[PDB]
Structure 1
Amino acid sequence: MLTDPIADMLTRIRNATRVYKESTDVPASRFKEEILRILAREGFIKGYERVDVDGKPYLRVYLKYGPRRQGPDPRPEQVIHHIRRISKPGRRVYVGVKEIPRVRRGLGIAILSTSKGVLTDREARKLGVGGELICEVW
């Protein structure tokens, strides 16, 4: 089995985008889906949808990129330049609202998991709560 399904996902995505895949499938879990929603809403992916690869539930994650480019190497810029796991089995990271980070002076996001559900570093700061710092994305 996978030891960390969220990191598995964050990477399937990190990988897929580096070779400009169209979409990418990841085994499904409510928690994973919950993270995609933030991912979608903040405009990092085009969105996702439940599908059934073989006989088991996955989540096509439609990736998104910038426009073709000039000079050598026309490959487009990435929407997801950076996506990294923070809390991990073996080293869970929890923060208080006063301790929620600020990814790239705001140009990026942190996805916390609170008792008020999965939120971004703002949705969390707004609702005045903290929790498990899941990852940062920019």
Structure 2
Amino acid sequence: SMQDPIADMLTRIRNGQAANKAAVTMPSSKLKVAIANVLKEEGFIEDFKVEGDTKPELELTLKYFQGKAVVESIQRVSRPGLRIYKRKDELPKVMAGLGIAVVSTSKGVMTDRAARQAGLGGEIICYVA
């Protein structure tokens, strides 16, 4: 069933990028809303919308550069079947610092660089490059 909506978000992205789709849309959620935001700020997507009210529909506008998709890889890390938590001194960095990892912290979800500057750990949602 849909027991992991996070992989679903990631996966809809991963496949739509692979399919040169201009955009993708999925059922929304606050945690998802926090991820579209981090992605925009790190220059991985154009923009997003949460259009809908009762059955909120989330929308990500994808991004392409040269014949390449801006998103080279995006994979789920922690997962309902095997949660991954790190402190601060164990925070992974992606692509040797290229790209980002999305982490959920005590003061919310942000990228590893941000969480690092604030000296905290949390549940590491994914890697992105």
TM-score by length of 1: 0.90
**Does 1:94 pair with 2:85?**
yes
Q: Could you tell me which residue of structure 2 aligns to residue 120 of structure 1?
A: 111
- TM-superposed CA distance for 1:122, in Å, is 0.5
Larger radius of gyration: 1
- TM-superposed CA distance for 1:56, in Å, is 2.1
1:38-77 counterparts in 2 under 5 A?
A: 38-52=38-52, 56-67=55-66, 76-77=67-68
Q: Could you tell me which residue of structure 2 aligns to residue 105 of structure 1?
A: 96
Q: Could you tell me which residue of structure 1 aligns to residue 122 of structure 2?
A: 131
Give ranges in structure 2 of 5+ residues lacking alignment: none
The amino acid across from 2:115 in the alignment is: A
Give ranges in structure 1 of 5+ residues lacking alignment: 68-75
Question: Tell me, what secondary structure is at the counterpart of 2:123?
Answer: strand
The amino acid across from 2:7 in the alignment is: A
Aligned residue pairs, count: 129
The amino acid across from 1:49 in the alignment is: K
In the TM superposition, structure 1's runs of 4+ consecutive aligned residues that sit over 2 Å from their partners are none
How big is each residue's C-alpha offset from its partner over 1:59-97, in whole Å with a ceiling of 9 and x where there is no partner?
A: 110000113xxxxxxxx1121000000000110000010
What's the RMSD between the two structures over aligned residues?
1.3
- TM-superposed CA distance for 1:46, in Å, is 0.5
Cα separation, 1, equivalents of 2:101 and 2:94 = 6
Cα separation, 1, equivalents of 2:32 and 2:96 = 26
- TM-superposed CA distance for 1:106, in Å, is 1.2
- TM-superposed CA distance for 1:52, in Å, is 2.7
Cα separation, 1, equivalents of 2:10 and 2:106 = 22
Q: Could you tell me which residue of structure 1 aligns to residue 24 of structure 2?
A: 24
Q: Could you tell me which residue of structure 2 aligns to residue 11 of structure 1?
A: 11
Cα separation, 2, equivalents of 1:94 and 1:44 = 24
How big is each residue's C-alpha offset from its partner over 1:5-46, in whole Å with a ceiling of 9 and x where there is no partner?
A: 011100011011111111100110000010110001101110
Cα separation, 2, equivalents of 1:80 and 1:127 = 27
